[PDB]
Amino acid sequence: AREFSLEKTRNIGIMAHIDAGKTTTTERILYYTGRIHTSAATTAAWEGHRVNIIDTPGHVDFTVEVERSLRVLDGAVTVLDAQSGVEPQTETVWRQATTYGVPRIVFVNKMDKLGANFEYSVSTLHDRLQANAAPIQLPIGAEDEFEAIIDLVEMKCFKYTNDLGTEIEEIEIPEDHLDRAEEARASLIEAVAETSDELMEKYLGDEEISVSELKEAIRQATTNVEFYPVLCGTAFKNKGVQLMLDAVIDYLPSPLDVKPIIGHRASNPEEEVIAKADDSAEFAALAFKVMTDPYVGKLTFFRVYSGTMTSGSYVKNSTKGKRERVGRLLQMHANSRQEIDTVYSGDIAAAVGLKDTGTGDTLCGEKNDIILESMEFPEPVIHLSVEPKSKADQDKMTQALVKLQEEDPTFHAHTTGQVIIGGMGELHLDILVDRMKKEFNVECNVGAPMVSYRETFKSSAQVQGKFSRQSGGRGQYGDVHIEFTPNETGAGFEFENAIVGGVVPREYIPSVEAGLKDAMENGVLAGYPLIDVKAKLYDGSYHDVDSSEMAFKIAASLALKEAAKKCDPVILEPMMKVTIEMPEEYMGDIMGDVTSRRGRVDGMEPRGNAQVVNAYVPLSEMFGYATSLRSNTQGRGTYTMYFDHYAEVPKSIAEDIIKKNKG
């Protein structure tokens, strides 16, 4: 039976600038929730509750990996430096968490350092973010005088007598602080009642609000992402850390308190599947980290959303379309490793030595096909060539690439030993290359990024392709007439067989189609794949011995070559959907920048004190976008970018592309 109920489970991340003390706060949480008074996830406990502490990345930019982490954790502790409150880095991350429906409590850390100011720090939540945040605590003293904390919910006071976290004394609220405490409690009830009609009716109706009534309302508002409790302390000198952990229990969600994860069936990507926490339901879990341990070998960390799985059983890796035997399962505690037999909905563990299961893969039952992570457009849009410095550097590169694919499912690599890497954007490529060079000690030269262009035809033509040769021992013969016509943008390749009366024998018709496919891949105008073209085979000739599958592949090739002279080919470029969220005062510079990159806007909508812009920008004009965005928003804006459609390149730009590719 499960040790801890669904209701008594807390999946949390810590969100903090390195300057706000993320690592000390993280060390203290691990100490207090451990047994004795770095892991992708630590299994821990507090007050009869399972607490799983999930590592969150330090990215200044929103990556596929940041998004994965928001989907694995359920709640977070946002840590601020008492001297400066919310900084730009803190703000971008906060806006991303709101989009993913993640409840937060705020911990104002460093209350003992020079310049500490609880009231100012709380005011930055209001001004920078328009967040409905209110103190549930008040500090007594600041800097070297920080000495006590008032719990405003219970109306009790806790005094600290040392820097170790022991011998805490409960005292009466000091006389000179009672008015200020009563005032803050009233402010706390008002901010919560803005989200609750029934509470507001009680408050205005001059009724008393019990402790249990107030906690319940705070929890409801918090787990609905309509309210943010604000707490205070100092992690390094152990004051307020135990009260912060009690607040994780009191106010942060169980796996049932947040929106369920959304996936689809492998057999039908348009059919939606909701995976809610339910031990009797079908199993579904998502892999989110892969570690290689010197003793146990490969560790794949996963979060279970629904159902249960037992060690020694077979599951489906639905992303690969392959079965996996789950041989052994580990939970990593602060001071020990623990082997377990079963993992339940809401739980996190690591599977030991999976053959073919990496980060971002879905596991489900053998009989089922739910997928929880994918991209609508999986293909790379930008590529880079990488040249190893030597044999030793070549060998290292081969190893690096295998390990990098386990960690990031969104890049592709093809390896003569020149390697071409394909990815989703300039930052993505830079992160991978950095990891190769620094972490796997590979010495290499890297080329300029190359956007993934395509070609298409703008007009139609009939052409003959005829192949007649005897080199060298006997003749090969193939003869086709084909009509080429442009297809709809996005509709792809379509081959039509209009041969009647066997003028081209049925056994060589698939060869005409396959020959056209292969030739189109090489492009006609600047070396990029030709797409969105229709081709109809309607006449030709043959001989009963001299014709061959091969002869007709070549005949079809010569026909495309003739058609490229007559069908007005053009270069197409990838157009990205660029979604920009920034404080509203930066509209002017954000929109001017979109215009300067040949982009356009289709809809912009307010969200809090922000605007959300739907823009379309050519990928070739997105180099340096994150830098300009950081500069135009004082570090406070964030964005995502995905492939959207192909568009024709302007005439003078295409001429540059052809001039350059001809050297």
Stretch that binds Cl ion, among 206-214, 234-242, 430-438, 574-582 (CB under 5 A): 234-242
Residue 242 touches which member of Cl ion, K ion, none, C-beta under 5-8 Å by kind: Cl ion
Contacts with Cl ion, 236-265, as mask; x by CB under 5 A: ----x-xx----------------------
Q: How many CB atoms lie within 10 A of CB 520?
A: 19
Q: How far is the CB of 588 from Cl ion (least distance, A)?
A: 47
Examine residue 513 and tell whether it contacts K ion (CB under 5 A). Answer: no
Burial of residue 256, with CB atoms counted within 10 A of its CB: 0-12 exposed, 13-18 middle, 19 or more buried: middle
Residue 111 annotated in ligand binding: yes
57 appears as a binding residue in the annotation: yes
| Nearest distance from C-beta of residue 62 to Cl ion, angstroms | 34
Q: Which is nearer to Cl ion, 158 or 227 (CB)?
A: 158
Contact between 351 and K ion per CB under 5 A? no
Annotated ligand binding at 367? The verdict is no
| Residue 17, annotated as binding a ligand | yes
49 in a known ligand binding site: no
The footprint of K ion on residues 593-652 (CB under 5 A) is: none
Q: Kindly state whether residue 231 participates in binding Cl ion, applying the rule CB under 5 A.
A: no
* Residue 105: partners with Cβ closer than 8 Å, 6 or more residues away: 75, 77, 78, 222, 228, 229, 230, 231, 244, 247, 248, 251, 252
Closest CA to 84 of 123, 51, 53: 123
Interface residues for Cl ion in 410-429 (CB under 5 A)?
none
> 16 labelled as ligand-binding?
yes
Which of 555, 568, 561 minimizes the C-alpha distance to 481? 555
Which is nearer to K ion, 53 or 149 (by Cβ)?
53
Q: What is the Cα–Cα distance from 233 to 26, expressed in whole angstroms?
A: 14
Q: Which residue of 116, 247, 348, 384 would you call a contact of K ion, by CB under 5 A?
A: 348
Using CB under 5 A as the binding rule, the residues of this chain from 588 to 617 that contact Cl ion are none
- Angle of helix 241-251 relative to helix 22-32, nearest 10 degrees, comes to 80
Closest CA relative to residue 535, chosen from 646, 456, 453, 476? 456
Q: Say which entry of Cl ion, K ion, none residue 243 contacts (CB below 5 to 8 A, set by partner kind).
A: Cl ion
Under the criterion CB under 5 A, does residue 284 sit at the interface with Cl ion?
no
Distance CA 254, CA 73 (A): 10
CB of 3 to K ion, least distance (A): 9
Give yes or no for residue 235 binding Cl ion (CB under 5 A): no
Write the DSSP string, 250-263.
HHS--TTSSPPEEE
85 contact choice in K ion, Cl ion, none (CB below 5 to 8 Å, kind-dependent): none
- Span from 114-122, 348-356, 581-589, 595-603 in contact with K ion (CB under 5 A): 348-356
Question: Cβ closer to K ion: 348 or 431?
Answer: 348
Residues with Cβ within 8 Å of residue 475, at least 6 apart in sequence = 468, 469, 543, 546
Residue 200 known to bind ligand: no
193 sits near Cl ion (criterion: CB under 5 A):
no
∠ Cα 416 417 421 (to 5°): 130
Q: How far is residue 309's CA from residue 344's CA, in Å, rounded to a whole number?
A: 7
Judge whether 369 is annotated as a binding position.
Answer: no
105 touches, from K ion, Cl ion, none (C-beta below 5 to 8 Å by class): none
Residue-wise DSSP of 460-497: -EEEEEEEEE-TTSS-EEEEEEEEEEEPPTT---EEEE
159 near Cl ion, judged by CB under 5 A: no
Is 24 annotated as a binding-site member? Answer: no
Widest distance between CA atoms in the chain: 110
Nearer to Cl ion, 240 or 358 (CB): 240
Neighbours of 647 (CB within 10 A): 14
Beta carbons within 10 angstroms of residue 461's beta carbon: 17
Q: Point out which span in 38-46, 94-102, 187-195, 235-243 binds Cl ion (CB under 5 A).
A: 235-243
Rank residues 235 and 286 by Cβ distance to K ion and give the closer one: 286
> Residue 112 contacts by C-beta under 8 Å, 6 or more apart in sequence?
142, 143, 144, 146, 234, 237, 239
* CB half-sphere exposure, 201, CA atoms < 13 A: 3
Which residues contact Cl ion (rule: CB under 5 A)?
240, 242-243
Which residues contact K ion (rule: CB under 5 A)?
347-348
Binding-site sequence positions for GTP:
16-23, 55-59, 109-112
